[PDB]
């Protein structure tokens with residue numbers, strides 16, 4: 135009734151329209167992987183596509199049922215088939231139809247490769263008259279039939295009754311095009327060492343020798359996080375809940391340190407209007423640690439809201455407040471008119487707009503001495519001498535607003551909450567120490583760190599050791615294995631047996647990595663007993679050592695060679 139069947143090598147369709155002839159194309163798409171459990175037939179999940187391939191039944195399978203839940207929900211689709219051919223419809227539908235509510239005809243084996251991507255439905259089909267008992271044997275490419283926009287989300291389907299529903303994954307194929315525009319054969323670039331070299335050479339035949347191929351890398355296992363212990367201070371309420379902040383000329387420089395700052399509380403405090411900033415992207419703030427967080431304050435009239443930014447000098451934002459060009463902070467601001475503005479003016483709401491020269495950024499001057507610019511010693515206003523003063527008068531645009539510019543700098547004190555996970559060590563594991571990211575195998579160090587320096591660098595200027603900021607212990611950041619693999623073949627015309635060579639690894643490390651499934655090359659070679667040899671360039675899998683000494687046929691390295699010799703098997707010997 136339902137058996138796993140893993141003997142299909144079919145389901146190759148035309149990727150596109152453009153004509154080709156007598157070429158070997160290489161393309162990647164969602165193809166059905168060779169030798170995958172399909173079914174041998176309820177509702178089924180629609181991951182990315184299927185390969186409904188029912189054999190002859192004199193048209194009793196009829197159509198299909200699609201949709202997102204198929205039970206009185208978002209619209210569905212039908213693939214009803216009859217003598218007139220397709221009569222497909224798309225609407226909500228209900229229990230069969232009986233209360234359908236809420237399109238054209240297109241004139242043995244019954245293959246389909248239904249695929250729904252980018253709001254388009256694809257019904258590739260091919261009616262192959264295969265009668266011989268060897269049903270799985272043979273090759274037949276599929277031709278597109280109709281593509282129509284459906285727009286609806288599909289994640290399940292039901293047959294409307296020998297079914298062979300399969301599943302689709304993203305893979306890479308090397309297609310063969312005929313002289314008269316057809317496809318004769320194809321090869322999957324994931325199975326065995328053999329059907330990977332034939333993809334890099336872009337040919338269906340290979341000659342004897344070694345062919346360099348892609349790299350191998352040991353994947354990690356889990357992830358850990360380490361943050362400073364706890365403070366629970368987050369004193370952001372003092373700044374943001376003050377009646378009057380300051381003037382533009384005289385402004386606070388509040389310092390914030392030793393707190394577990396939460397940045398999610400600011401979003402509901404007022405009507406923000408300029409919550410944008412540089413250096414660090416917003417909504418990613420609550421994941422990393424800082425060093426010198428500060429906070430300013432202004433009651434700027436509102437015409438210079440765009441003037442508060444790196445640059446944008448406008449003769450008003452150059453004597454009062456100036457930001458550096460490489461300003462790594464945020465310019466959080468909001469709107470306030472109910473309590474700030476008033477029909478009259480304010481004494482301290484002024485700006486010195488008549489100073490001789492602009493300031494270096496991050497500087498403030500309070501001196502109230504009258505400016506002197508006359509030739510003779512001046513006594514008051516009227517000559518070039520004049521004490522700058524404005525005393526701006528608000529009038530309920532022109533409504534004064536509030537600006538709470540921060541200042542970041544990146545020994546860390548201020549950073550957000552994050553769960554802590556106990557150390558594991560001695561495994562290829564991700565890590566997060568305060569603020570950083572990497573991958574390696576942590577272990578107990580043996581260095582002589584002095585009690586003021588945390589990190590540890592190297593000649594190449596790479597991180598080497600980081601102190602744990604909960605136990606005050608030093609560790610190592612050594613990464614784990616990666617390299618390259620080379621495939622040995624004796625020629626397609628002779629045999630189909632290969633060997634592999636993981637370059638430059640003491641491969642007891644990879645032998646255990648096979649069992650726990652950490653390798654990147656998902657394909658595996660038959661690693662039986664008396665079948666692994668440790669060379670000076672790595673280890674050879676699939677060849678057995680021999681005490682004899684012949685002439686070299688395929689040069690390996692370090693003084694050994696591999697040749698195909700007669701039962702027949704690949705052997706590895708020493709040059710002579």
Ligand SMILES: *[C@@H]1O[C@H](CO)[C@@H](O)[C@H](O)[C@H]1NC(C)=O
Pocket residue numbers: 136137138171172173
């Ligand atoms: C293959 O699919 C069948 C479907 O019946 C399932 O039972 C079986 O466990 C699968 N085999 C795998 C995932 O190795």
Ligand SMILES: *[C@@H]1O[C@H](CO)[C@@H](O)[C@H](O)[C@H]1NC(C)=O
Pocket residue numbers: 140141270
């Ligand atoms: C796959 O298994 C089927 C089971 O019916 C068999 O007929 C077919 O020959 C097999 N194909 C192989 C082993 O390539």
Ligand SMILES: *[C@@H]1O[C@H](CO)[C@@H](O)[C@H](O)[C@H]1NC(C)=O
Pocket residue numbers: 202208286287288289
């Ligand atoms: C498809 O779209 C509908 C309507 O917006 C939505 O409710 C549903 O979650 C989506 N389904 C899937 C499987 O993404």
Ligand SMILES: *[C@@H]1O[C@H](CO)[C@@H](O)[C@H](O)[C@H]1NC(C)=O
Pocket residue numbers: 312313314
């Ligand atoms: C189509 O291709 C086949 C296969 O090679 C060939 O025999 C046949 O002559 C071609 N038909 C043409 C060119 O009309």
Ligand SMILES: *[C@@H]1O[C@H](CO)[C@@H](O)[C@H](O)[C@H]1NC(C)=O
Pocket residue numbers: 376378379380385386387
């Ligand atoms: C600005 O100046 C002082 C300096 O200590 C600061 O503590 C205070 O919060 C600010 N004053 C007002 C009135 O906002």
Ligand SMILES: *[C@@H]1O[C@H](CO)[C@@H](O)[C@H](O)[C@H]1NC(C)=O
Pocket residue numbers: 363604605
């Ligand atoms: C961190 O806090 C825990 C809370 O139980 C405490 O036991 C531990 O000593 C603290 N560690 C340091 C280094 O202060």
Ligand SMILES: *[C@@H]1O[C@H](CO)[C@@H](O)[C@H](O)[C@H]1NC(C)=O
Pocket residue numbers: 640642
């Ligand atoms: C490989 O590692 C094993 C186990 O630690 C060791 O006995 C052997 O000498 C190593 N081989 C080489 C070539 O370093």
